[model samples]
Target: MTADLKSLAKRIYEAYLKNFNMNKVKARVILSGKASNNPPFVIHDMETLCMAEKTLVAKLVANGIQNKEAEVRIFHCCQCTSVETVTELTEFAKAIPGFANLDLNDQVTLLKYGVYEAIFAMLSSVMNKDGMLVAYGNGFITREFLKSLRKPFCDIMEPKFDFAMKFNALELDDSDISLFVAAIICCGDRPGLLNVGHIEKMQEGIVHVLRLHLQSNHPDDIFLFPKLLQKMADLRQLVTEHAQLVQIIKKTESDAALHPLLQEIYRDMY
Candidate 1:
């Protein structure tokens, strides 16, 4: 009776592999001194930040959050990243096995609430307290550089880094994370679901698949399953706090470059 869930996990895993960011993969290979004809993408480390003291980006660096110039740079770059993540996330939602069968409104609601949670969760692969890979793994957005901007922008990333750091400890691969991501979308508790009963039923299967995947894959780690669920709880609180930061951005930076997509994600909270 429950046998199909194993196939469900495999389908989710295949979808993740299908959606894998190959550009970043090649960049990672090149990042490790595997030379190709391509020119190296620079890592934006502290040297750039220090040199900024004399450059245009640096002036705003010293100017704090008051100056509009800094925000323009920060937001434009950030929103570009958001555009990509949102696109990939939408693709991921569509690729889910039963997602296409759901009510259209249900599908949108799932994507709406689930996007940030999935993006933030998957970000652990590229992020830590020190920095995150940006520009398709070319540039590293240092934590210090973000702090230079002060409130709003700086405050925004801190929680993500904090969350990413802990979540990364689970050391889940794409296959493992694919199941988790599916479980997140299939959750019963997301508001405005027309088919909570169906979603919850699917969620139960995904959860079972996740346990089975970990059991086979992480045989030595006894506590991995609970930690996984715990991170989901952490995600719940993280998104709530994330919404609060969104409000802070809206209230303080009326001219901030937040996009309509991001604004909608944070809309209910706003």
Candidate 2:
């Protein structure tokens, strides 16, 4: 049954990736209100550059929420992105065999612990070392901009950006990311788990398939499997660091609030 479940997980992961191209989804969402074929602007002055930045920032803060502070705007943009990604992840979890069979409290518990790790993994698809695209590309927030944020808030993002640049070098496609996310979701060590043995069994199955998938897909990349496994550990550490950062942000940037669902997740995790 475990072997069959492993095969099923792989198949479902592949099917999900085949049907959903996040790159295309993000592009369409970002370009929806604008002229899709419009050429890029050439900003020759600080005034024009500032105007461009404000426009992008405004788009990022949903429901006409406005902020004069760049740090606040960037933070809000990230919150919006996190919400969308988590929604998709929730659906993905529901699609997994045996996941929806879990108790409702258990499902929420798993998501609370697992979603941030999955978000970090999916982010590699859209990130580069210098900056990351936010609000689906309404803006490209730079490393320098992130660094300018207050104290540990600034510290929160740099490590993930650094890790992303290295992770992208592995060039895993959506299929690989889906498998990795499934493995993260099924983790047995998460606090408040009601069925540790069942969850561990599911996670083991997913991890087994992920190893085989990496080896078969990356024939010449001799160390890919081990490296991918290492990333899971790195992701764990990153989430820990991020949770601490979130606590600080909640204290200092309370006005630039996190989404309610995210707030709940954080509360549950911490």
Candidate 3:
């Protein structure tokens, strides 16, 4: 952690004590990416925040501070990560003299990249450590949290050599599978595709991923598939809500269509 991170943590702790407001404290942590001049995609979801929380908890535990006193709570912002926020963050950056060097569009692009990286790192760390403890609202939403804290959190049930495997393993002829592959092709790369085609593919990927998931026998396999399916649904909703920008993107003559908002997925290949 750098001095800035330490300072942010200190401010957050202090704010937690004063406001006794979890959202306020969380907003502080989430807003750090903006303050650090990083991209906007760095917003802390439950996964990333949980890792930070665990790190915080570990520090507290080491200092003989118990978990109960921390009074941790988690939240789910259904509309937390959106294009509008991206636009807003872009505009916010423009207010800075240095950021003015980049056009508003370019500034948004930079923040978008930063946010993606931040989120990926956070998620990767949690995946590495399993999952973290997350509490949202008055209820204790511990499953996602507990999963993070535990070892071997990945849902690793390889698809069986069944019809689905034959369908997806080498080639597929199913319309749903074809659509899913199309979704992967369209939005699998930067900022993500925000159009009807994008939505269709997303749904396709969800259904196909679910089939692979259902082939698994792990304890959490059943629950995990539906949860992921829901995520695709959520992504569709997000894109649908921003149809105008999607149209602008399609109309623009650029390489925008080639890149989906993902990490270094193309860095290596077998």
Against the reference, the lDDT scores of all candidates come to 0.72, 0.71, 0.31
Whole-model lDDT, model 3: 0.31
Model 1 over residues 197-251: C-alpha lDDT tens digits?
8777777877888999989888988899999898888887888888787677777
**TM-scores for the candidates:** 0.83, 0.81, 0.23
- Give the alpha carbon lDDT tens digit for every residue of 72-163 in model 3: 22211211222223333333333222344434444443354333222221122112121221222112222334334222211111111121
Runs of candidate 3 with Cα error greater than 4 angstroms are 1-88, 119-140, 143-270
Across 114-191, the per-residue lDDT of candidate 2 in tens digits comes to 889988987776576666655445455566667766665578678888888899888887667778788888888999
As for model 2, its CA RMSD to the true structure in angstroms is: 4.5
Question: Which candidate leads in TM-score?
Answer: 1
lDDT of 1: 0.72
TM-score of decoy 3: 0.23
The RMSD of every model to the true structure, in order and in angstroms, is: 4.6, 4.5, 20.6
Per-prediction tally of clashes: 0, 0, 18
Regions of candidate 2 where Cα sits further than 4 Å from its true position = 1-10, 18-21, 24-68, 150-152
Instruction: Count steric clashes of candidate 3.
Output: 18
